[PDB]
Design a protein around this ligand. Sequence first.
Ligand SMILES: NCCC[C@H](N)CC(=O)NCCC[C@H](N)CC(=O)NCCC[C@H](N)CC(=O)N[C@@H]1[C@H](O)[C@@H](OC(N)=O)[C@@H](CO)O[C@H]1NC1=N[C@@H]2C(=O)NC[C@@H](O)[C@H]2N1
Lengths: 122, 54, 117, 119, 211
Amino acid sequence: MIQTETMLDVADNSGARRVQCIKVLGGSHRRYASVGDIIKVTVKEAIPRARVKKGDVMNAVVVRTKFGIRRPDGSVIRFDDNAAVILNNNKAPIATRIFGPVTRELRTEQFMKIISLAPEVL
Amino acid sequence: AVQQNRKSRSRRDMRRSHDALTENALTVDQATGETHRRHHVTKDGFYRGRQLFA
Amino acid sequence: SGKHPLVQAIENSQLKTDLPEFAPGDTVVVQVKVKEGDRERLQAFEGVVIAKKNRGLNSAFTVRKISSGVGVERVFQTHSPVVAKIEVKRRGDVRRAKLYYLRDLSGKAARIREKLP
Amino acid sequence: MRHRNSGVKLGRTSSHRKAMFENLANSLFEHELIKTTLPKAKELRRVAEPLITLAKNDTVANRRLAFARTRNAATVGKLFTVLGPRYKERNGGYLRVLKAGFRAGDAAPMAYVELVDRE
Amino acid sequence: AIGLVGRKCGMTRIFTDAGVSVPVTVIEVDPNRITQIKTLETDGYQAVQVTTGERRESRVTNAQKGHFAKAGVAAGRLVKEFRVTEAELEGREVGGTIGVDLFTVGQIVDVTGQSKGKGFQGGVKRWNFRTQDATHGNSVSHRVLGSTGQNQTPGRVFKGKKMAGHLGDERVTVQGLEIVSVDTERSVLVVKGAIPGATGGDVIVRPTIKA
RNA sequence: GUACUCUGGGGAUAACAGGCUGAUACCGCCCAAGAGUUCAUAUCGACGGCGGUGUUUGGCACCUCGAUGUCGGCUCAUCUCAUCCUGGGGCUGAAGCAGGUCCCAAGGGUAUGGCUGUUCGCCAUUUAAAGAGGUACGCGAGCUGGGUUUAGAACGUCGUGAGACAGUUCGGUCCCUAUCUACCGUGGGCGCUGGAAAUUUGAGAGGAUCUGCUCCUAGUACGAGAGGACCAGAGUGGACGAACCUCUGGUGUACCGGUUGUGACGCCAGUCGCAUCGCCGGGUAGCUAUGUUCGGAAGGGAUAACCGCUGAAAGCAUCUAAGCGGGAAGCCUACCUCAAGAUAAGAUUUCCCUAGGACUUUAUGUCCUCUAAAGAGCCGUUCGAGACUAGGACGUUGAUAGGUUGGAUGUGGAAGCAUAGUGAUAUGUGAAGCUGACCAAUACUAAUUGCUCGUGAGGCUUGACU
RNA sequence: UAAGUUCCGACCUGCACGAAUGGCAUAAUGAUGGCGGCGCUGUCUCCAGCAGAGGCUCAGUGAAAUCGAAAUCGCUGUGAA
RNA sequence: CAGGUCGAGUAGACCAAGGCGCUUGAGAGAACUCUGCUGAAGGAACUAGGCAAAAUGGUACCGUAACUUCGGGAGAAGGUA
RNA sequence: GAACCCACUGUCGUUGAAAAGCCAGGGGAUGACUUGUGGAUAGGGGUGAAAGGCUAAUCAAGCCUGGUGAUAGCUGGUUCU
RNA sequence: GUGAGGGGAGUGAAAUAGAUCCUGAAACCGCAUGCAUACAAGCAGUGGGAGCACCUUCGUGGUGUGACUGCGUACCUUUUG
Ligand SMILES: NCCC[C@H](N)CC(=O)NCCC[C@H](N)CC(=O)NCCC[C@H](N)CC(=O)N[C@@H]1[C@H](O)[C@@H](OC(N)=O)[C@@H](CO)O[C@H]1NC1=N[C@@H]2C(=O)NC[C@@H](O)[C@H]2N1
């Protein structure tokens, strides 16, 4: 349940450490973004000498939320943090490693690389 | 906020047309033969063939 | 049994008849059925039971674990067919029904003492 | 809305309400016949009758529970000596609430509360 | 269309074999007894009138007692009509009964009920009005209506202006629900989702009109 | 000089809003040099001409100075169409995808932030789109009070000075319990051709009306390539709305437990009062969204622009004059809710009342006597119904409420007594004790004896059948 | 800062700074003016539940400002507009 | 003048001696208003402005920068029991 | 940092409990401090760490009584046929 | 209620001269009788006009009411209005 001004950790090695959501994409007046939704972010902290830098405006996909997601049997899965993965201008991941578990909502053709790189899919 | 014109006696009485009082439900008690308020103990302490105060 | 008898009768025909006895503070392994296309498999979810709701067919229990440095909790619905099997690996010694205080502890501070017969 | 809710307010805080109903129960157990307002009389059943139900078995734990609820040693003694044996075979309904007209000072509806086998 | 009158018993869930949890509402159906058939010749329209439940004779009036005795059926707790067509009228006669077997598993139905009563309610809850600031100098206007009109032109409040008033306790129809189970031995309909009203209320189940 | 100010007056006379007008403003049309490789009119269009609207800047001084008291924001709106998106078309310097221009169309929809008191504007990032206007430049007896425009103080500047400003800066009281109209809800009365209990028809009224992306047709038609469709299907979302509480959560000051200080119950033990529910951890029902489900689907009829068929006036041609068609998110239906105070007061089923005297005002006539129906209400136990009402259930031939018994749930190892320890404490008895609102049984308690209202076959005229 | 009419530093064509109507600075101090950050949060997205006091009903007491008189509707037009 | 238990205290919580329950009550538990408690995910996106709320908070020890009129800054910050 | 003396912010109150307050925060608190009693300064005068502040709920000239029935080219009103 | 207040009795020419007591107007507020009034839009009247009730010199009469209907935006002041 991510909205504008929300801070997110970065679950990859693109170089950013903390990002801030500045827009939820996908419709007029849309309020929240969940796992698998695309957001616009600004980079608040980054690794020195990395490709991405502080103050960059990029696209990202949300991979973990504290609000959690629902499953068809009525269960809910909740994580301890809100995390995102950086994407390029074509909305494709631009990292080579994934940190922490992700969920099966990412099993699409767009985000199959995250699934294949993640240490755990639950 | 306050009226611009004084209200007529006719309109005042028309408003009061709903102020009439009604009657209570009174019944005669079989044990004593006295009038009492229905479902209530009588003023002498009797109800439904029982006595409260010796 | 706070519902009408007809509702109770409808719920009773779906109850599982082989669940083990487990309590908050235990560590359990839950086998979840994962269906991909037509590929069926079983995935293990192992962790500490921090909450348990006993409501007949509406029973549930919450399991918390640490995965690659990230804490994750899942609220399993006890009688759902998705939960294939529940194993109790170790019995814990706690003083309360709900263990939400474990969410603010890490590593050594979050250790649960074993219940000794 | 107050859908399916139980309990009363009577223009009092919760602690004041609890103390008032405690006092009413003690007075009723002492005198076996009291006069009060109708809402207080009707709510007094839910407080007084479980005490009589508890007093049917004379144990140390039951006496201590009764003392915690009433804070009156004479009330505890009377409950466990007279009232409980009296109602040992009666399945509830130890009180009797009867409408008793209205009060002069404020026109408040009144009622009598009586023990079932007073005399 | 011809339907059924039932009573809402409460909500529960059904687990499918794949593990999906389906939220469902249970409807008890005392088999509806036909009390009168209305035709074009005598009434000017075609309907089937039914009754269901029970009622004690001290509460059944003499007129209703005669009405039930003409049909030859026991008095019910309610009487209700269904508008029907000539094809639907086939096989239905006064004194017959209609059961849960009128519906089949998987059929799409509409369910009508009487929604819960919320009493006197304000703009925020009744019409989703926005509240004004809780701070920044706002005096006593947090949940009030605000402006209700324009000015000298037109110098009045238009009809249909949204204001505070009674909310709930109204007839509501929910369309497009799916029949999950038809239990004939228990005389029960299990439908998917939520239906209007409180537990114990009277509901009407009809075949969907969005066909 | 007065902003430290005061009195008598004026809407005879200014600032706001209204009014008249329309120079100005905005919009449209006529002619057409020319531009467009040729070619005025695909798209522009000089020099000139004719109008429309009532948004702008103005002109006038008709209303208000025994007061019409506000720039912007907030909340809530309603209308217009000169249409921003979505829908339907003609032309094109329209291959396709796109675009340009004009016509029809007002059903719905139509951003969040940084800066500034701002409206505006610039910028960042979205969206199908972020339309133009009227409504006292809508809305302050609905909120605010940042700007302007009292009294304090300072700077630049002007003045000898009191003081002042095509200026700036720090600070600086927002009253009113709603009579009438209007509006949102909810009742009382009477009427409706004897009375009553139910079920109903629908004259009509309101609600709703939005849209993205992916796949497929098909890398097909088209195109040198680059690119890339119409039409027609499937799936999955955004915003909006309703209902609901099975699931996920919040709350849950009458449920359970831990614990600090103090006082008390004679003392230990065990408890209770007060300290925000003392604080802290949980939590049943109910309520609730951030949770769950559902909706705007499909189809008829008349049309708008536009496209016709046949066809003369006018031997040809021609959608039109006779005659016959197609055609839109728009209209009437269709979907949901309300609806006979629809005084035109409608329909159907069933139920109730069939007695005697006197008199004159010989009449649905006035007094007597006898009758009191079917039902309705008062009262009581109450409710998932409720401000009061109204509405629903029940009143002993009874489960309506409380209690009682059982179950379930929550909290979690009661008290007492035993052990083991110097002791704090731990263990056993035993998942014990306690458990608001839940489920099911159960007349123990309370719904008692009752009363009031509502009558006695329902005028006359004509017609059709008896 | 993603985006800065405010802020900080600098530039000097200062409409119209300038040396006791003092000039330029200055540690400490200020319920003094402006700008930024951490923590924090119902300020807000967007409100929900609960407690007390009113509101509402009943019994008692019992005001107010205003007021030519009222059998005190909508729309379009008219008309001291 | 002014006691007790904790306490630096005449602060504070609960009590003593000694005084009071404040001269309308009884019900109900709608909108709306006032005063409080709690709140999923987010955390100033609110707004003229973090207004208001939330937050910090004790004792002992450790440790503490630029600047400085050498006094300060300083309880800086931060940490342990 | 209490008493005591003040009055920076906010909600409430505005026919108030009150013709200037309550509540939650806030400043000083051995000094240019706060305070009792009794005195002195009197209206173009007094007093003023200076706001035209204060001088009995009254201040760019206090209050009371007289001149006095001030004057008003202004507004209102002006009674039977 | 040994209250207040009243009904009789008695006094007096008169007690509706009975104590805040001669006369007892109007605004304003009750009770009783007659007629009208719950499908109809506005300065409330005016010119017509049916019916009803009582009275009666029996009518071409008197009193009260007024279904239905044409017309009809108070008064004063100040003003071009
Ligand atoms: N001969 C006729 C003479 C006529 C007489 N002039 C009429 C008159 O003057 N009326 C005055 C009305 C004032 C007050 N409303 C009276 C009342 O109604 N009191 C109710 C009490 C009645 C009860 N039954 C007796 C009771 O509990 N007593 C206690 C007790 O003695 C004691 O406590 C302990 N723990 O022992 C004491 C503490 O010191 O407190 C007393 N309680 C108290 N409550 C009183 C309060 O608040 N204020 C005044 C004073 O009375 C206080 N004391």
